[PDB]
Amino acid sequence: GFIGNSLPMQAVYRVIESAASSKATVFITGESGTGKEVCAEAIHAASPRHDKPFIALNCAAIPKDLIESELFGHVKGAFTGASTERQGAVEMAHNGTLMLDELCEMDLDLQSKLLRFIQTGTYQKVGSSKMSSVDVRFVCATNRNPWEEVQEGRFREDLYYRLHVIPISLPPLRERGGDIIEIAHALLGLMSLEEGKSFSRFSEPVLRLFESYSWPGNVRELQNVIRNIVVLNTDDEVKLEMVPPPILEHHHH
Numbered sequence: 001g002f003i004g005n006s007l008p009m010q011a012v013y014r015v016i017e018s019a020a021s022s023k024a025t026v027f028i029t030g031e032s033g034t035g036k037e038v039c040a041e042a043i044h045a046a047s048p049r050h051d052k053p054f055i056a057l058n059c060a061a062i063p064k065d066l067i068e069s070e071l072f073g074h075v076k077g078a079f080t081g082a083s084t085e086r087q088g089a090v091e092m093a094h095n096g097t098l099m100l101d102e103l104c105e106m107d108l109d110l111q112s113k114l115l116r117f118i119q120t121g122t123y124q125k126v127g128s129s130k131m132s133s134v135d136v137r138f139v140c141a142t143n144r145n146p147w148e149e150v151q152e153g154r155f156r157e158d159l160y161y162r163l164h165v166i167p168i169s170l171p172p173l174r175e176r177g178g179d180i181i182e183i184a185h186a187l188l189g190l191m192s193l194e195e196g197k198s199f200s201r202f203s204e205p206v207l208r209l210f211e212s213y214s215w216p217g218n219v220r221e222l223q224n225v226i227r228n229i230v231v232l233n234t235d236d237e238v239k240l241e242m243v244p245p246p247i248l249e250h251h252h253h
Protein backbone atom coordinates (compact mmCIF):
# COMPACT_ATOMS: atom_id res chain seq x y z
CA GLY A 1 0.00 0.00 0.00
CA PHE A 2 3.07 2.19 0.14
CA ILE A 3 3.48 4.85 -2.54
CA GLY A 4 6.83 6.10 -3.73
CA ASN A 5 10.39 5.16 -4.68
CA SER A 6 12.34 7.51 -2.40
CA LEU A 7 15.73 6.37 -1.11
CA PRO A 8 14.64 5.79 2.53
CA MET A 9 11.50 3.89 1.50
CA GLN A 10 13.48 1.60 -0.77
CA ALA A 11 15.46 0.45 2.27
CA VAL A 12 12.14 -0.23 4.01
CA TYR A 13 10.93 -2.23 0.99
CA ARG A 14 14.04 -4.41 1.06
CA VAL A 15 13.49 -5.23 4.74
CA ILE A 16 9.82 -6.00 4.08
CA GLU A 17 10.70 -8.42 1.29
CA SER A 18 13.36 -10.20 3.35
CA ALA A 19 11.33 -10.28 6.57
CA ALA A 20 8.17 -11.54 4.86
CA SER A 21 9.51 -15.08 4.38
CA SER A 22 10.48 -15.26 8.08
CA LYS A 23 8.21 -15.78 11.07
CA ALA A 24 10.43 -13.48 13.15
CA THR A 25 8.51 -10.72 14.89
CA VAL A 26 8.63 -7.29 13.24
CA PHE A 27 8.69 -4.18 15.44
CA ILE A 28 7.71 -1.01 13.55
CA THR A 29 8.48 2.46 14.90
CA GLY A 30 8.27 5.96 13.48
CA GLU A 31 6.56 9.28 13.97
CA SER A 32 2.79 9.54 14.05
CA GLY A 33 1.29 9.21 10.60
CA THR A 34 4.16 7.38 8.90
CA GLY A 35 2.18 4.29 7.88
CA LYS A 36 2.74 1.50 10.39
CA GLU A 37 -0.35 -0.50 9.45
CA VAL A 38 0.46 -0.07 5.76
CA CYS A 39 3.88 -1.53 6.54
CA ALA A 40 2.37 -4.37 8.57
CA GLU A 41 -0.03 -5.30 5.78
CA ALA A 42 2.77 -5.18 3.20
CA ILE A 43 4.81 -7.68 5.20
CA HIS A 44 1.80 -10.02 5.23
CA ALA A 45 1.13 -9.59 1.52
CA ALA A 46 4.72 -10.50 0.62
CA SER A 47 4.75 -13.49 2.99
CA PRO A 48 3.76 -17.10 2.26
CA ARG A 49 0.77 -16.38 4.54
CA HIS A 50 -0.62 -13.77 2.15
CA ASP A 51 -3.77 -15.80 1.42
CA LYS A 52 -4.49 -16.14 5.15
CA PRO A 53 -5.96 -13.27 7.21
CA PHE A 54 -4.22 -10.06 8.19
CA ILE A 55 -5.69 -8.74 11.44
CA ALA A 56 -4.85 -5.38 13.01
CA LEU A 57 -5.60 -4.81 16.71
CA ASN A 58 -5.41 -1.08 17.49
CA CYS A 59 -4.83 -1.06 21.24
CA ALA A 60 -5.55 2.69 21.30
CA ALA A 61 -9.04 2.50 19.73
CA ILE A 62 -10.01 0.17 22.62
CA PRO A 63 -10.42 0.88 26.36
CA LYS A 64 -7.44 -0.51 28.25
CA ASP A 65 -9.61 -2.85 30.33
CA LEU A 66 -11.07 -4.34 27.12
CA ILE A 67 -7.91 -4.99 25.10
CA GLU A 68 -7.69 -8.51 26.51
CA SER A 69 -11.24 -9.31 25.38
CA GLU A 70 -10.49 -7.93 21.91
CA LEU A 71 -7.20 -9.85 21.70
CA PHE A 72 -8.11 -13.25 23.21
CA GLY A 73 -11.91 -13.16 23.02
CA HIS A 74 -14.38 -13.72 25.83
CA VAL A 75 -17.23 -16.04 26.74
CA LYS A 76 -20.79 -14.82 27.24
CA GLY A 77 -21.04 -13.70 30.85
CA ALA A 78 -17.30 -13.21 31.38
CA PHE A 79 -17.89 -9.65 32.61
CA THR A 80 -20.87 -7.34 32.95
CA GLY A 81 -21.35 -6.29 29.33
CA ALA A 82 -20.55 -9.70 27.80
CA SER A 83 -23.81 -10.12 25.90
CA THR A 84 -22.16 -12.47 23.38
CA GLU A 85 -19.27 -14.88 23.02
CA ARG A 86 -16.61 -12.90 21.15
CA GLN A 87 -13.84 -14.43 19.06
CA GLY A 88 -10.49 -12.81 19.74
CA ALA A 89 -8.13 -11.25 17.24
CA VAL A 90 -5.73 -14.16 17.77
CA GLU A 91 -8.36 -16.54 16.41
CA MET A 92 -9.19 -14.25 13.49
CA ALA A 93 -5.46 -14.23 12.62
CA HIS A 94 -4.83 -17.99 12.86
CA ASN A 95 -2.42 -19.12 10.09
CA GLY A 96 -1.96 -15.43 9.21
CA THR A 97 -0.48 -12.22 10.60
CA LEU A 98 -1.52 -10.26 13.69
CA MET A 99 -0.58 -6.60 13.99
CA LEU A 100 -0.39 -5.38 17.58
CA ASP A 101 -0.80 -1.67 16.88
CA GLU A 102 0.01 0.87 19.62
CA LEU A 103 1.09 -2.11 21.70
CA CYS A 104 2.42 0.06 24.55
CA GLU A 105 -1.17 0.89 25.57
CA MET A 106 -1.54 -2.57 27.15
CA ASP A 107 -1.35 -2.66 30.92
CA LEU A 108 1.36 -4.73 32.60
CA ASP A 109 -1.07 -7.52 33.54
CA LEU A 110 -2.00 -8.03 29.89
CA GLN A 111 1.66 -7.74 28.86
CA SER A 112 2.31 -10.76 31.09
CA LYS A 113 -0.42 -12.75 29.32
CA LEU A 114 0.85 -11.57 25.93
CA LEU A 115 4.38 -12.74 26.78
CA ARG A 116 2.99 -16.22 27.45
CA PHE A 117 1.03 -16.23 24.18
CA ILE A 118 3.98 -15.06 22.08
CA GLN A 119 6.15 -17.88 23.44
CA THR A 120 3.72 -20.80 23.38
CA GLY A 121 0.89 -19.69 21.11
CA THR A 122 -1.55 -20.59 23.90
CA TYR A 123 -4.24 -18.37 25.39
CA GLN A 124 -7.56 -18.36 27.21
CA LYS A 125 -10.71 -16.46 26.35
CA VAL A 126 -11.65 -13.95 29.03
CA GLY A 127 -13.86 -15.69 31.57
CA SER A 128 -12.94 -19.17 30.31
CA SER A 129 -10.59 -21.80 31.70
CA LYS A 130 -9.98 -23.71 28.46
CA MET A 131 -6.59 -23.43 26.80
CA SER A 132 -6.47 -22.87 23.05
CA SER A 133 -3.67 -22.25 20.59
CA VAL A 134 -3.18 -20.54 17.22
CA ASP A 135 -0.33 -19.89 14.78
CA VAL A 136 0.17 -16.16 14.13
CA ARG A 137 3.07 -14.15 12.77
CA PHE A 138 3.46 -11.04 14.93
CA VAL A 139 3.97 -7.47 13.78
CA CYS A 140 4.25 -4.88 16.57
CA ALA A 141 4.03 -1.11 16.23
CA THR A 142 4.08 1.89 18.52
CA ASN A 143 4.43 5.65 18.30
CA ARG A 144 6.14 5.78 21.68
CA ASN A 145 9.82 4.98 22.15
CA PRO A 146 9.63 1.27 23.08
CA TRP A 147 12.94 1.51 24.90
CA GLU A 148 11.97 4.57 26.95
CA GLU A 149 8.73 2.74 27.82
CA VAL A 150 10.87 -0.12 29.14
CA GLN A 151 13.06 2.31 31.09
CA GLU A 152 10.11 4.06 32.73
CA GLY A 153 8.80 0.67 33.85
CA ARG A 154 5.72 0.86 31.60
CA PHE A 155 6.63 -2.07 29.32
CA ARG A 156 7.93 -5.50 30.30
CA GLU A 157 11.62 -5.95 29.56
CA ASP A 158 11.43 -9.66 28.72
CA LEU A 159 8.49 -8.90 26.42
CA TYR A 160 10.49 -6.20 24.61
CA TYR A 161 13.41 -8.51 23.80
CA ARG A 162 11.04 -11.26 22.65
CA LEU A 163 9.38 -8.86 20.18
CA HIS A 164 12.25 -6.64 19.04
CA VAL A 165 13.69 -9.08 16.51
CA ILE A 166 13.23 -7.31 13.16
CA PRO A 167 12.90 -3.56 13.79
CA ILE A 168 11.66 -1.24 11.06
CA SER A 169 11.92 2.54 11.43
CA LEU A 170 9.64 4.33 8.97
CA PRO A 171 11.02 7.60 7.55
CA PRO A 172 9.10 10.82 8.19
CA LEU A 173 7.21 12.29 5.27
CA ARG A 174 9.57 15.28 5.08
CA GLU A 175 12.50 12.97 4.19
CA ARG A 176 10.67 11.01 1.46
CA GLY A 177 11.46 13.34 -1.45
CA GLY A 178 9.18 12.78 -4.41
CA ASP A 179 6.88 10.51 -2.39
CA ILE A 180 5.09 13.52 -0.86
CA ILE A 181 3.65 14.74 -4.15
CA GLU A 182 2.91 11.23 -5.39
CA ILE A 183 0.95 10.52 -2.20
CA ALA A 184 -0.73 13.92 -2.46
CA HIS A 185 -1.88 13.13 -6.01
CA ALA A 186 -3.33 9.79 -4.91
CA LEU A 187 -5.14 11.47 -2.01
CA LEU A 188 -6.40 14.25 -4.28
CA GLY A 189 -8.09 11.78 -6.61
CA LEU A 190 -9.49 9.63 -3.81
CA MET A 191 -10.86 12.50 -1.75
CA SER A 192 -12.32 14.06 -4.91
CA LEU A 193 -14.21 10.80 -5.45
CA GLU A 194 -15.33 10.74 -1.82
CA GLU A 195 -16.55 14.36 -1.93
CA GLY A 196 -17.97 14.45 -5.47
CA LYS A 197 -15.33 16.91 -6.68
CA SER A 198 -12.84 16.75 -9.54
CA PHE A 199 -9.45 18.10 -8.47
CA SER A 200 -6.70 16.79 -10.74
CA ARG A 201 -3.55 18.86 -10.17
CA PHE A 202 -1.68 21.15 -7.79
CA SER A 203 -0.40 24.56 -8.80
CA GLU A 204 3.36 25.05 -8.71
CA PRO A 205 3.34 27.14 -5.48
CA VAL A 206 1.40 24.38 -3.72
CA LEU A 207 3.88 21.77 -4.93
CA ARG A 208 6.80 23.86 -3.66
CA LEU A 209 5.08 24.34 -0.30
CA PHE A 210 4.26 20.64 0.07
CA GLU A 211 7.83 19.68 -0.81
CA SER A 212 9.43 22.06 1.72
CA TYR A 213 6.95 21.87 4.63
CA SER A 214 8.11 19.69 7.53
CA TRP A 215 4.82 17.73 7.86
CA PRO A 216 5.09 17.09 11.62
CA GLY A 217 1.89 15.05 11.34
CA ASN A 218 3.27 13.13 8.32
CA VAL A 219 0.74 11.40 6.03
CA ARG A 220 -2.13 11.94 8.47
CA GLU A 221 -1.54 15.70 8.31
CA LEU A 222 -1.30 15.49 4.51
CA GLN A 223 -4.63 13.65 4.49
CA ASN A 224 -6.10 16.44 6.65
CA VAL A 225 -4.80 19.14 4.31
CA ILE A 226 -6.06 17.41 1.15
CA ARG A 227 -9.47 16.81 2.75
CA ASN A 228 -9.63 20.43 3.91
CA ILE A 229 -8.91 21.59 0.37
CA VAL A 230 -11.38 19.30 -1.40
CA VAL A 231 -14.20 19.90 1.10
CA LEU A 232 -13.84 23.70 1.16
CA ASN A 233 -13.15 24.36 -2.54
CA THR A 234 -14.43 23.47 -6.01
CA ASP A 235 -11.86 23.59 -8.81
CA ASP A 236 -9.68 21.46 -11.07
CA GLU A 237 -6.52 22.89 -9.54
CA VAL A 238 -5.36 23.35 -5.96
CA LYS A 239 -4.30 26.98 -5.57
CA LEU A 240 -2.04 28.42 -2.89
CA GLU A 241 -4.89 30.39 -1.28
CA MET A 242 -6.67 27.08 -0.61
CA VAL A 243 -3.94 25.64 1.63
CA PRO A 244 -5.13 25.86 5.27
CA PRO A 245 -3.10 27.03 8.28
CA PRO A 246 -0.60 26.45 9.75
CA ILE A 247 1.14 25.21 6.63
CA LEU A 248 2.43 28.57 5.37
CA GLU A 249 2.69 30.21 8.80
CA HIS A 250 4.64 27.52 10.69
CA HIS A 251 6.76 26.94 7.56
CA HIS A 252 8.24 30.42 8.13
CA HIS A 253 8.39 30.24 11.96
Ligand SMILES: CC(C)(C)COC(=O)CNc1n[nH]c(=O)[nH]c1=S
Pocket: 001, 002, 003, 004, 033, 034, 035, 036, 038, 179, 183, 186, 187, 190, 219, 223
Ligand atom coordinates in the same frame (compact mmCIF):
# COMPACT_ATOMS: atom_id res chain seq x y z
C1 LIG B 1 -4.82 6.61 -1.45
C2 LIG B 1 -3.78 6.22 -0.35
C3 LIG B 1 -3.33 4.77 -0.60
C4 LIG B 1 -2.59 7.19 -0.49
C5 LIG B 1 -4.43 6.36 1.09
O1 LIG B 1 -3.83 5.53 2.12
C6 LIG B 1 -3.01 6.13 3.07
O2 LIG B 1 -2.79 7.32 2.99
C7 LIG B 1 -2.12 5.20 3.97
N1 LIG B 1 -0.76 5.77 4.22
C8 LIG B 1 0.28 5.77 3.33
N2 LIG B 1 0.08 5.49 1.87
N3 LIG B 1 1.04 5.50 1.09
C9 LIG B 1 2.49 5.79 1.51
O3 LIG B 1 3.33 5.76 0.61
N4 LIG B 1 2.70 6.04 2.84
C10 LIG B 1 1.71 6.05 3.73
S1 LIG B 1 1.93 6.35 5.31
